[PDB]
Design a protein around this motif. Sequence first.
Motif, PDB file in Angstrom:
ATOM      1  N   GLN A  26       0.735  -1.294  -0.077  1.00 48.96           N
ATOM      2  CA  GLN A  26       0.039  -0.053   0.288  1.00 48.96           C
ATOM      3  C   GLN A  26       0.959   1.245   0.051  1.00 48.96           C
ATOM      4  O   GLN A  26       0.448   2.167  -0.537  1.00 48.96           O
ATOM      5  CB  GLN A  26      -0.938  -0.070   1.185  1.00 48.96           C
ATOM      6  N   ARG A  32      -3.247   6.562  -3.424  1.00 48.94           N
ATOM      7  CA  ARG A  32      -4.433   6.067  -2.943  1.00 48.94           C
ATOM      8  C   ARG A  32      -5.501   5.627  -3.924  1.00 48.94           C
ATOM      9  O   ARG A  32      -6.690   5.675  -3.447  1.00 48.94           O
ATOM     10  CB  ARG A  32      -5.026   6.922  -1.864  1.00 48.94           C
ATOM     11  N   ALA A  35      -6.842   2.377  -2.553  1.00 50.55           N
ATOM     12  CA  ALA A  35      -7.089   2.107  -1.367  1.00 50.55           C
ATOM     13  C   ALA A  35      -8.706   1.711  -0.861  1.00 50.55           C
ATOM     14  O   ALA A  35      -8.789   0.978  -0.075  1.00 50.55           O
ATOM     15  CB  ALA A  35      -7.100   3.688  -0.891  1.00 50.55           C
ATOM     16  N   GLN A  36      -9.663   1.898  -2.007  1.00 54.33           N
ATOM     17  CA  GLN A  36     -11.120   1.850  -1.611  1.00 54.33           C
ATOM     18  C   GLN A  36     -11.634   1.219  -2.738  1.00 54.33           C
ATOM     19  O   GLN A  36     -11.107   1.256  -3.764  1.00 54.33           O
ATOM     20  CB  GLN A  36     -11.804   2.961  -1.332  1.00 54.33           C
ATOM     21  N   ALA A  57      -8.686  -1.789   1.345  1.00 51.35           N
ATOM     22  CA  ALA A  57      -9.487  -1.689   2.359  1.00 51.35           C
ATOM     23  C   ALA A  57     -10.043  -3.132   2.611  1.00 51.35           C
ATOM     24  O   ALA A  57     -10.379  -3.570   3.581  1.00 51.35           O
ATOM     25  CB  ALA A  57     -10.631  -0.591   2.409  1.00 51.35           C
ATOM     26  N   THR A  58     -10.691  -3.752   1.230  1.00 52.27           N
ATOM     27  CA  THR A  58     -11.355  -4.956   1.299  1.00 52.27           C
ATOM     28  C   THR A  58     -10.556  -6.057   1.444  1.00 52.27           C
ATOM     29  O   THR A  58     -10.839  -6.843   2.417  1.00 52.27           O
ATOM     30  CB  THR A  58     -11.899  -5.348   0.010  1.00 52.27           C
ATOM     31  N   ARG A  60      -7.733  -5.629   3.732  1.00 48.26           N
ATOM     32  CA  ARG A  60      -7.396  -5.516   5.235  1.00 48.26           C
ATOM     33  C   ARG A  60      -8.743  -6.031   6.014  1.00 48.26           C
ATOM     34  O   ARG A  60      -8.408  -6.626   6.915  1.00 48.26           O
ATOM     35  CB  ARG A  60      -7.333  -3.928   5.367  1.00 48.26           C
ATOM     36  N   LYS A  61      -9.853  -5.955   5.543  1.00 47.98           N
ATOM     37  CA  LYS A  61     -10.833  -6.665   6.206  1.00 47.98           C
ATOM     38  C   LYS A  61     -10.898  -8.220   6.314  1.00 47.98           C
ATOM     39  O   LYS A  61     -11.034  -8.763   7.384  1.00 47.98           O
ATOM     40  CB  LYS A  61     -12.516  -6.145   5.467  1.00 47.98           C
TER      41      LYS A  61
END
Length: 121
Positions: A26, A32, A35-36, A57-58, A60-61
């Motif tokens: 990252q 970014r 990032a999302q 982000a996905t 990281r979840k």
Amino acid sequence: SMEQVAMELRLTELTRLLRSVLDQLQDKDPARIFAQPVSLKEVPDYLDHIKHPMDFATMRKRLEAQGYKNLHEFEEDFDLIIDNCMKYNARDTVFYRAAVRLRDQGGVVLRQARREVDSIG
């Protein structure tokens, strides 16, 4: 069982290693761009193009749910970020160019994580 606990300790440590790998990958996306998730409000046709969306982000979840069983699974998700972007965006875009740079710079990080995972078991 004592085995299920030892297994759980390995997974926790794998998760710990993959968390550092994710942070390093990252950092290679300073803009970014990845990032999302791609916004379906803003790109309403995206899923007609990309069948398996992915973003940091996905990942990281899933990571914090200890949802990655091995590095191969983790790589698969990283590779989706890059490959989805290089399909949806044309070659002469800031998005495509960002994906190429992330791929090239991440290869170094992934190269060593494969050795660390093989080494530490």
